[PDB]
Amino acid sequence: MLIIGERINGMFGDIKRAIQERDPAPVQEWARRQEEGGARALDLNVGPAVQDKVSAMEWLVEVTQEVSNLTLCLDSTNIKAIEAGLKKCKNRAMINSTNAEREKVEKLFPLAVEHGAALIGLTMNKTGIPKDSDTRLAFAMELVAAADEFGLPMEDLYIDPLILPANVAQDHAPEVLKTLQQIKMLADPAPKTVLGLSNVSQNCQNRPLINRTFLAMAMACGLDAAIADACDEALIETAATAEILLNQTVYCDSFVKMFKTR
Amino acid sequence: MLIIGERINGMFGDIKRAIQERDPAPVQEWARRQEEGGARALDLNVGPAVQDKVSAMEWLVEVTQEVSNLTLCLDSTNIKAIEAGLKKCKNRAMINSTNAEREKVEKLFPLAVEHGAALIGLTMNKTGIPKDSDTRLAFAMELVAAADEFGLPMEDLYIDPLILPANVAQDHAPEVLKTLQQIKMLADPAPKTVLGLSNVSQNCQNRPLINRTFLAMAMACGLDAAIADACDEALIETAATAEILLNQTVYCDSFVKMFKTR
Amino acid sequence: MAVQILRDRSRAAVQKVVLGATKDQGGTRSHTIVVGGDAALPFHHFEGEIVNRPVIGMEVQDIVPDWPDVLKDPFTDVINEPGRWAQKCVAEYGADLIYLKLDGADPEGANHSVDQCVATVKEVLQAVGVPLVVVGCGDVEKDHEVLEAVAEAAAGENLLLGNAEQENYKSLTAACMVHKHNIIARSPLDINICKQLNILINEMNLPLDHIVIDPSIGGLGYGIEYSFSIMERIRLGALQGDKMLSMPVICTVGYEAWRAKEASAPVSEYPGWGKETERGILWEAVTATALLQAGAHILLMRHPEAVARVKENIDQLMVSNAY
Amino acid sequence: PLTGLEIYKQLPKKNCGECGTPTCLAFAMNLASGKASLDSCPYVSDAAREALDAAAAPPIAKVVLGAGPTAVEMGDETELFRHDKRFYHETAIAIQVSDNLSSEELKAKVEAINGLNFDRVGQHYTIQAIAIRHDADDPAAFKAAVASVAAATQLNLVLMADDPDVLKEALAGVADRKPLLYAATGANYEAMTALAKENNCPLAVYGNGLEELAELVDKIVALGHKQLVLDPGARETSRAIADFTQIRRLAIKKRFRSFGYPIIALTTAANPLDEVLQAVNYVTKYASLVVLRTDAKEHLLPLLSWRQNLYTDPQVPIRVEEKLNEIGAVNENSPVYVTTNFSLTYYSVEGEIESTKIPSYLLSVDTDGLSVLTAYADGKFEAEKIAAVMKKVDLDNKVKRHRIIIPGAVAVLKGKLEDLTGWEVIVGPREASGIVAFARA
Amino acid sequence: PLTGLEIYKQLPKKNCGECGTPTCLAFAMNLASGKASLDSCPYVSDAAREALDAAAAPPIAKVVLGAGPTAVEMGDETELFRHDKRFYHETAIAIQVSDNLSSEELKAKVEAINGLNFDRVGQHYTIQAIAIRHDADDPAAFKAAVASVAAATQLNLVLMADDPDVLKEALAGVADRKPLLYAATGANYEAMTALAKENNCPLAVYGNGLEELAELVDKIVALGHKQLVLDPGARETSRAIADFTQIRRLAIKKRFRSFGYPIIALTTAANPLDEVLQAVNYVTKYASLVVLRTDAKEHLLPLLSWRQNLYTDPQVPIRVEEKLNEIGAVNENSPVYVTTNFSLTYYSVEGEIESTKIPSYLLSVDTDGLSVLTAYADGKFEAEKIAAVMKKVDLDNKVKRHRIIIPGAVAVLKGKLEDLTGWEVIVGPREASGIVAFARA
Numbered sequence A, B: 001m002l003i004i005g006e007r008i009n010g011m012f013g014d015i016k017r018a019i020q021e022r023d024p025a026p027v028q029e030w031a032r033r034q035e036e037g038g039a040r041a042l043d044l045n046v047g048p049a050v051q052d053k054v055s056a057m058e059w060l061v062e063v064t065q066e067v068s069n070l071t072l073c074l075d076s077t078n079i080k081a082i083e084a085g086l087k088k089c090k091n092r093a094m095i096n097s098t099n100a101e102r103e104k105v106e107k108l109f110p111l112a113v114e115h116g117a118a119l120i121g122l123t124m125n126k127t128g129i130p131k132d133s134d135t136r137l138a139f140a141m142e143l144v145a146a147a148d149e150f151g152l153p154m155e156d157l158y159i160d161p162l163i164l165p166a167n168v169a170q171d172h173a174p175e176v177l178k179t180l181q182q183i184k185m186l187a188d189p190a191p192k193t194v195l196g197l198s199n200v201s202q203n204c205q206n207r208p209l210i211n212r213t214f215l216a217m218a219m220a221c222g223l224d225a226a227i228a229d230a231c232d233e234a235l236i237e238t239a240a241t242a243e244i245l246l247n248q249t250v251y252c253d254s255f256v257k258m259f260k261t262r
Numbered sequence C: 001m002a003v004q005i006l007r008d009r010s011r012a013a014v015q016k017v018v019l020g021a022t023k024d025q026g027g028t029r030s031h032t033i034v035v036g037g038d039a040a041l042p043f044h045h046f047e048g049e050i051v052n053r054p055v056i057g058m059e060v061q062d063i064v065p066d067w068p069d070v071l072k073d074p075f076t077d078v079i080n081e082p083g084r085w086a087q088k089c090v091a092e093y094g095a096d097l098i099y100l101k102l103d104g105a106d107p108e109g110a111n112h113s114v115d116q117c118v119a120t121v122k123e124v125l126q127a128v129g130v131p132l133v134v135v136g137c138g139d140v141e142k143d144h145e146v147l148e149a150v151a152e153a154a155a156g157e158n159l160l161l162g163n164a165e166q167e168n169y170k171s172l173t174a175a176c177m178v179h180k181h182n183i184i185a186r187s188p189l190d191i192n193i194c195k196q197l198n199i200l201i202n203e204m205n206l207p208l209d210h211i212v213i214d215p216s217i218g219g220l221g222y223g224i225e226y227s228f229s230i231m232e233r234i235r236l237g238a239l240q241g242d243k244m245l246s247m248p249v250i251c252t253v254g255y256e257a258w259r260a261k262e263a264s265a266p267v268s269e270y271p272g273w274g275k276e277t278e279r280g281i282l283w284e285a286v287t288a289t290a291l292l293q294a295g296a297h298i299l300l301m302r303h304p305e306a307v308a309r310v311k312e313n314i315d316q317l318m319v320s321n322a323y
Numbered sequence D, E: 001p002l003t004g005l006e007i008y009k010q011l012p013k014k015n016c017g018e019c020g021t022p023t024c025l026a027f028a029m030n031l032a033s034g035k036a037s038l039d040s041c042p043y044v045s046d047a048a049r050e051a052l053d054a055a056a057a058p059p060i061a062k063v064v065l066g067a068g069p070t071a072v073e074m075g076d077e078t079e080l081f082r083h084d085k086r087f088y089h090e091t092a093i094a095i096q097v098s099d100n101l102s103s104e105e106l107k108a109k110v111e112a113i114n115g116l117n118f119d120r121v122g123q124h125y126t127i128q129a130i131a132i133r134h135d136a137d138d139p140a141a142f143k144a145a146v147a148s149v150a151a152a153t154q155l156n157l158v159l160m161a162d163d164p165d166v167l168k169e170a171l172a173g174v175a176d177r178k179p180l181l182y183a184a185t186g187a188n189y190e191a192m193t194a195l196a197k198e199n200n201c202p203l204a205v206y207g208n209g210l211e212e213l214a215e216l217v218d219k220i221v222a223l224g225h226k227q228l229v230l231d232p233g234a235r236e237t238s239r240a241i242a243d244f245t246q247i248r249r250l251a252i253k254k255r256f257r258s259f260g261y262p263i264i265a266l267t268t269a270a271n272p273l274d275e276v277l278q279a280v281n282y283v284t285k286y287a288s289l290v291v292l293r294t295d296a297k298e299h300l301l302p303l304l305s306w307r308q309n310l311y312t313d314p315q316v317p318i319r320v321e322e323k324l325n326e327i328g329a330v331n332e333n334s335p336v337y338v339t340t341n342f343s344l345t346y347y348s349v350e351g352e353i354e355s356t357k358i359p360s361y362l363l364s365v366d367t368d369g370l371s372v373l374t375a376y377a378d379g380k381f382e383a384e385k386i387a388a389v390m391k392k393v394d395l396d397n398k399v400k401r402h403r404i405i406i407p408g409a410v411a412v413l414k415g416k417l418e419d420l421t422g423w424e425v426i427v428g429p430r431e432a433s434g435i436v437a438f439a440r441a
C-alpha cells in the first residue's frame, strides 16, 4: 500500500497562506511530517483560492523536493500547471489526474509517458460520476486501452473508481469495491488502483474510523494506493496490517514500525 | 454482521473451573457482557478438560438461556453432546460444526433441519486444511449441495473457510479472502459465511488490531458472521462501520451505537 | 407446474403506537387507536400478520381555512367552529382521528394567542371522543410556546404532537416526554435524516413506540414517487430489523393533494381534465391509495368523500389474502 | 453468471469423467468458472439444455399488443421495487364496452373513450385499448360490436368471448391489428390456442387461482404459443395484490417459467370511484394491462398521473429544454424570470405565471434536470454560469429592460450575479407560488 | 476467461453492433464476464478458435510417456515457486545408452540401469526411462540396440535419432510402449510429426534458441500433433536455467501456447559429479525430463533425493503409520522409545538406533505427522496421547520390562506420564544422535 500524503493542499488554510505569500516553511514541514507518518508519496495541490496555477505548482514542486525525495503527486485540473510542474520535478512523479475523455487522454497520457511519470485515471466521462460499477468498468477499460495505445506501462496507470461520501451516497461504496475487484480482469498485468480516501467520510461522523475501515476493505479488493491522511497513525496501522493479511509483506511482530519506516 | 461471542469456552481458565464445579455465575456474566458489547449469538464450548461432554453441554445451554435469549452456538466435536444440547434449547441455535466428510454430513445436516438450527460447515475433510482457494471452494460446493440434498435452507448454512494465524500460515489469509468472494458462484441465494476470527492473530503482536482489520477485509469479501471477542470495542466499531460501507444498513451518524444496541 | 408460494418471513415488525387514553388511563377519550405492528409488506397477509388497519384523521383548523369552495362546502355549517367541525367529521364522515391543525397561530396570519390555541384544543376534546393529532402553524418560535402549553393542558390525553425536525426537535420531544404524548418526526425526504432524527429523539428518553415518521410526502403528480420509494425503504428497513425505521408512518395527503392545480381548477378552463369535483376527490384519494401501498399507517385527509372511498379501499385490503 | 448448484442439479450424476472432470459436481463448479462447454457432457436431458439457456434469459417475456405505431410493449420487467432500478413499461389501460349495448350507445361510448387523452405539466397521457365484452345472447351481436368498435377507433383491441367459434367469426376482419384474445380456459384452450397461433395474436390465459393458471400456461406453451398475458382469476383487490406479487416474484426470484409473462387485471368495483382506487392498486402491484369500465375524464386523469409517476426513472430527472420560454403575451416590456431545468420546477414557475396570467419570459437554465437547491449544491448554479446564460439565451434582444428575478432560496448569489452580468437582480419569493404576489408589488 | 485487453486487440475494429454489443471494446467486457459468446461476431480471424482454447486450457499441457502401469505424466504444472502451492509431477529421469555399445556391453549396462532404484527413510526412488542414442554409422545398429534394450527392461524408452527412417525401423517393435521420439527439427519435422501421429507417441521438438523452438512448435501443432516436449537447445547451465524459466513463465503468466508443454533437458558435463550438479539445477528449474549419462548408484541417489524433496507437498507432512516397529530382532529385554509419526522424526530415530545395532521397539504416536517439538507445542503430544497409545500399541505383550524412553525435548512430560501409564518413563537425548551412548549406560 502506497500512502500518498494529502496535506499539502491549497484548500487548507496554512497551505493557502503559504502559496499566496510564497513561504516554503509550512509546505516543507508538512512534507516532512507526512513522510515521518508513513507516506511515500506527496500530493501537491495549489488549491481553489490561488489563481496563478502555472506558477504556483512550480513553487510547490521546488520547495518540497528541497527537503524530500518522495514521489510528488501533482494535483491539478490545469495541464499547464501539471506540465510545468513535471519540468521542475527532480524526483519521480505522478499525475493527478486524467479522465476517460479523449480530449484529456490525448493530452495527459503521452505527457506522462514522455516524463515517465505515473498517471491517475478517473473512471468518469464529461457527464459526471457513474452510478454503478459496470459503467465504472467501461471507463476503466477505456483507460486501459489508452495505456496500451500511448505506450504507458500498465503498472504506472492508477485507475480511480471514484469513492463518494457514505452519508449522501452510501450505495456507491460497494459499487467501488466491486469495481476494484473486477479491474484485475481488464488487463494482465492488471492496472493499479488508487482512491481519494478521505472522500468516503466527507461530512460524516467519526471520519478516521470510516476512512481506515474502507481502506482495509478496498485493499482486500485490490487497492494499491491511497491519497489520505498520512498523519493519522491508526490509518497507517491499518495499511500496515492489511498488507500482512494480504501476504504482500512478510509478517514480523514489529510490522507496524516496519511499514512506517519503510 | 452477526457477532458470535467466543468467551464462554472451556479452554478459558475461569470457564473450565465453572463447569467442573457447576458455578453458573461466570457463564451467565460472560453471557451478559458479550450481549452488552454487541453479540447476538453465544458460542458455547465444553472444553478439553471435561469428560462427560453431554452433561456439560446441557448445563451450559441451561444456565445460559436463563439470562439470555440470544442464539446459542453449540460448539463441540462431540455430536452426541450437540443433539443433547439442542434438546434443551428454548431459543434458536446453531451447530458448530461439520466438515465435508460424508460421515459427518449425514450425521449433522438432518440434525440441523430437525431442530430448525443453523449449521456451520468447515471446508475440509480428514486430509487437513486446504491451502488453495479452489480446494476450499470445492469443499464448499459439497456443503452447499448437501444442504439442498437434506433440505437445509441455504441461508442456514454457514460456510467456514478456516482462517489460520498470520505468523506461521500467512499465505492462507488471502486464500480465505478469495474463497469468501468466490462463494457467490456456488448458489443463488448464496450461502452464508463464518470465521473463527481470533485464530488469525494467535501468537501475534497486537491481536486486536489484526482481528478487526481482517474482519473488515473479510466482510468486503462477503463475510456474514464471526466467532470473536464481543467485548472488544474497537472490533465492534469495525463491524458497524463495514456494514455501512457495504450498504447493508442505512447510514446514520450514530451508526456505531445502533449496531451495539441492535 | 406445481406452484409453491414464495413467503418472505420478517425479522422484526413496525412498532405499535397507541393513540389516546380513556378515563381509567387518565384521559377523556372514548377509546384508543392502535397503529403499526405490521410483520410484512403492506397488506401481505400471506407472509406476515397485519394486525392493525391504517386510520384516517380528518383536518380541523382554528380558522376558516383558505381552501377551495369544493373543500369547504361539506362543512359550511360548522367550518367556523372547531368543536362542531370535529363532531361532523366523526359522526357523519367516519373520521378515526381528528387532525387539529392550528394555522390560526401564524404570527403573519390570525396570530391566535397561546390561550386561544389551548381553548381550541379543549373545545375539540370536549366535542368528540376520538384521539387527537395536534400540530402548529409552522412558525418555529410560536409553535414552541403553543405546543408546550397544549402538552401541559391536555396532559393525560396521550396526544400525537408534531412536528419535530432535524434542527428543531428538543423542545417538542421534552414536552412529549414529560407530559406523556406521542411525537411526529418530520424529515425532508431523506431516509438518513429520518433515521438519525428518530435516534436524537429517542436519546432524550422518549420511548421508540411513542414516535411516528412523517417523510414529507409529495402530492400526486408533484413528486409522490419519491416519497413512495422512501416509504418502501422505511418499511423494508423495519422488516429487516432496523429499529430506527420501525416507527409507523404518517402522511399529510390532505395538504399536499389540495395545493395541486389539478385538484381544484375549473373544467371551464381545463376541459380535458373533466369535472372538478370528482377530479379533486380522486386527486386526494389516489394520493392516499398509492401511499397506502408504500406502508402508510396514518393518513391526514380533508375531503369526506375521498375519506369514504379510501376507508373502503382499506377495508378491501384488510381482507386476508393468505393461501 | 450461473450458480454452481443450478448447473449441478441438472446433471446425470454419473461421475463418469467423460467431460474431463472427476465428478459432475466438480464439472458444474467448473462450468460456473467457464472452463469446459456444457456440450462436454454427452448425457443429461434435453430439458437441461432448455432450463440452462432460459436461466440466462430475462425473467419476464416481452409481448406486444397490437401492431404498427399503435402497438404497445407489455411485460419485460426485472424489479420488485422501482428504487432497486426502475420499472420499464407503463401499464396498458383498456376501457371496457359491452355488446349488450345498442349501436348508438356503443358509438357514444367509443367516441368518449377516444377522448381520454390528457395534457399536463408538459406531459401527454393516453390509454391503450378498448375491450369488447360478449354479454349478448346471440353470437352475431359480438361480431356486430367489434366491427362497430373497430370502425370507430384506432386504439388496440381486446376481444372477450369464451366460445372460440364466436370469437373466430368476430376476429377475421380485425386480425390484422393483433388484438389480445380473451381468454384461454381449461375448457377451450385447444381451440383458443389454435386461433391465437394461426392469427399471431397475443393470448390471455385464465386460471382460477395460481395453480390452475400455471398448468394452463404450460399446456399452451407446449402447443407452441408464447405470447401470453396472465389472469390468475383474482376479482378482489387483496387477492389480486397477493397473486400479482407471486407471479412477479416467482418469475424474477425463482425463474418460474410458467409465470414469466405480463399480467392482465380486471377491476370489479361497481362504484367508479372505488374502481379507480382498485386500478391504482393494480398498476402499483405489477399489472401490465388493466381493464376499466368507467370512461370519465375526471376518473382517468389521476390514475394516468399515478401511472406516469410510478414508472418515471428514479435515476434520471424529467427535464425541459434550456431555451427562453415565452409566457402569455409578448410585449417586450415583460419581466424575465430565472429558474432551473427540472420539469417539476419549470412548470411550477410557469404554471404560476400562467395560472395568474402574467405574460412574461421564463428562462430555463440547464441544470441537468436538477432542482434549484440540487443544482446549486452540485455547483451547477453559479453566478458566472448564470451570466453566460443571460447572454447565451440572447434575451437582451427581446426585453426593453434588463432586470432578472432570482430564486429566493438562492438570494446570496445575485449580487455576485448582478455585477458580472450587468443586469438588475431582484430576489423573488422562496417558493414559486409567491410570484402572483411579487409581480403586482 | 482471458484478459479483456487481449480479446479486444484480437477482435477486429469494426464497431458494427452485429454481436449485440454497441462497440468492440464493450464486447470485450461482455466476453470476460460471460454475457455473450464470440460466435455472435461474424468478423474475426482464426484467433477466435485460439481464444477458445488458450483461455480454457491449463497453461501447461499434460503429455504422457509410455503406456500402462509404467506410464509417467509430464508437464501439467501451474507454479513457479513450490511454496505458492506445490510442484505436481516429479522429474522423469532417463539414463542414456549408445548403440555403439556391443551386444554384451549393452545388456550389462541395462542390467545396471535396472538396478537404479533406492530405498531410504521410508521412501522408494526409481528412474523412468532409458534413452537409446543413435551414434553408430550404419542405421541397423539402432534397431538392434532398441530391440535388445526393450527385451531387457520394462522401463520407458526415448529414441534419439535425426533420421526419421531410422526411428521408423525401431518403432515397429516398441510403438505400443509409447516411447518419446527425439527429435523434430527444422530439417525433419514433417516426417517426424507424421511418425508421431501414426504411432501416437509424444514428440520432442528441438530449436536452437527460444525463437526457433516457438516457430517449430507452431508448425507441428498446425499439423495436428500436440503431444510435445520442448528442447530450446540449451547445452550450458546458465542458458538452460534462463530458457526453462522463460518457457515456464510464458506459458503460466502469458498463456503463450507455443510453450504450453513439458521440457526435456540434456546434461552435457563430462565429469559425472559435475553432471549430477547440473541435473539438480535442471530439476529445480522446471525440467520435466532430464537425460543423464552416468549410471552409478552413488550419483543417482543424491539426485533422486533432491527431486523427492523439491516435489514434496509443502502443506502435507509425510507420516509414518502409528503402531510400534521392531528394530532388528527385538527380544523381551530390549528398550522402548517414544516418538511422533512424522516420517522425518520417526526415521531419525530408526536410523540412529539401527546404526548402533540396538535391538528395540519404537512406538509412533500419531501427531498428524508433526515433529516432536511441533506437535508438543500444538497440544497433540501431551502426556495423555502418549499414555493412551501405550496400550493401543500392543507393546505390553512384547517386553518383560515396562520402561519408556521419552525424547529429551519432552522431558517435562515425565511426571505426568508415569502416573497414568504404570510405566517407568526415562528421559532420552534431546537428539537421537546420542541414543547410542544413552543405551550403553
Ligand code: B12
Pocket (backbone or CB within 6 Å): A168, A169, C188, C189, C190, C216, C223, C226, D317, D337, D338, D339, D340, D342, D344, D345, D348, D349, D369, D370, D371, D372, D373, D374, D375, D377, D378, D405, D406, D407, D408, D409, D427, D428, D429, D430, D431, D432, D433, D435
Ligand atoms: C429529489 C432531491 C434530489 C434528487 C434530484 C432531484 C432534482 N432533479 O433536482 C437527487 C437525489 C439526485 C439529489 C441529489 C442531491 N441533493 Co438533493 N434533494 C432532493 C429533495 C428531496 C427534493 C428537491 C425537489 O425536487 N424539490 C422541489 C422543487 C420544486 O424545488 P425548487 O427547485 O427549489 O423550486 C421551488 C423554489 O425554489 C422556488 N423557485 C424556483 N425557481 C424560482 C424562480 C423564481 C424567480 C422565484 C421567485 C422562486 C423560484 O419555487 C419552487 C416551488 O416551491 C430536496 C429537498 C427537500 N426535501 O425539500 C433535496 C435537497 C435539495 N438536496 C440537497 C443536496 C445537498 C443534494 C446533493 C448535493 C447531496 C450530495 N450528494 O452531496 C445531491 C446533488 C449532487 C449529486 N447529484 O451528486 C439539499 C440542498 C440544500 C443544501 N445544500 O443544504 C436538500 C435540501 C436536502 C437537505 N440537505 O436537507 N437531490
Ligand code: B12
Pocket (backbone or CB within 6 Å): B165, B167, B168, B203, E317, E337, E338, E339, E340, E342, E344, E345, E346, E348, E349, E369, E370, E371, E372, E373, E374, E375, E377, E378, E405, E406, E407, E408, E409, E428, E429, E430, E431, E432, E433, E435
Ligand atoms: C517445519 C516446522 C513446522 C511445520 C510442521 C512440521 C511438522 N510436520 O511437524 C509447521 C509450519 C506446520 C509448524 C508449525 C508450528 N511450529 Co514449528 N517448526 C518447524 C521446524 C522449522 C522444523 C521441525 C522439524 O521438521 N524438525 C525435524 C525433526 C526430525 O525434529 P524432531 O521431531 O524433534 O526429532 C528429532 C529429535 O527430537 C530427536 N527425537 C525424536 N524422537 C525421539 C525419540 C527418542 C526416544 C530420542 C532419544 C530422540 C528423539 O531426534 C530427532 C532427530 O534429530 C522447527 C524447528 C527447527 N528449525 O529446528 C519449528 C519449531 C518446532 N516450531 C515451533 C512452533 C512453536 C510451532 C507452532 C506451535 C507455531 C504457532 N503457529 O504457534 C506451529 C504448530 C501449531 C500449528 N500447526 O498451528 C517451535 C517449537 C519450540 C517451542 N515451542 O518454542 C520451533 C522450534 C520454532 C522456534 N520457536 O524456534 N512448524
Ligand code: SF4
Pocket (backbone or CB within 6 Å): D011, D012, D013, D014, D015, D016, D017, D018, D019, D020, D021, D022, D023, D024, D027, D040, D041, D042, D043
Ligand atoms: S460426463 Fe456428464 S455425467 Fe459424466 S461425470 Fe461429466 S458431467 Fe457427470
Ligand code: SF4
Pocket (backbone or CB within 6 Å): E011, E012, E013, E014, E015, E016, E017, E018, E019, E020, E021, E022, E023, E024, E027, E040, E041, E042, E043
Ligand atoms: S460484431 Fe464483432 S466487429 Fe461488429 S461491433 Fe461486435 S465485436 Fe465489433
Ligand SMILES: [Ca+2]
Pocket (backbone or CB within 6 Å): A190, A191, A192, A193, A222, A223, A224
Ligand atoms: Ca491490485
Ligand SMILES: [Ca+2]
Pocket (backbone or CB within 6 Å): B190, B191, B192, B193, B222, B223, B224
Ligand atoms: Ca454474504
